Amino acid sequence: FSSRYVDLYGGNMFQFATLPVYDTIKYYSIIPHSIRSIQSDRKAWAAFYV
Amino acid sequence: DDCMQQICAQYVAGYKVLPPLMDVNMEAAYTSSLLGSIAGV
């Protein structure tokens, strides 16, 4: 579900895509992302909430 | 007429509202006769 497709400002979530996986998923993990840049290039990043 | 323009008792047809048998104007006439008796006594 993505809020951006229909109501990004509202934050209401509407289904935008379906993943066709027959098997149920019992586990999930966050994948860390690292930005490669010089000290001047580095900028603050927003923190996501689960 | 308002329903056609657009609650909907007639449209469902399951139930129909029944008139009281006395209009507000007729009820007012009964009240005026009673008011006259109150003035008399």
Partner: protein, 47 residues
Amino acid sequence: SFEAKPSGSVVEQVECDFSPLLSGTPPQVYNFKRLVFTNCNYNLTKL
């Protein structure tokens, strides 16, 4: 009720492939494979 006769009907209404189901090695009953078809025309008579 005296409901009005039904009249003036307004009707509002692709070709998903069934080849994987009819081709290749069938999986075992425990290994059953399920395929989802969405918003596609179908030909059950042909199958």
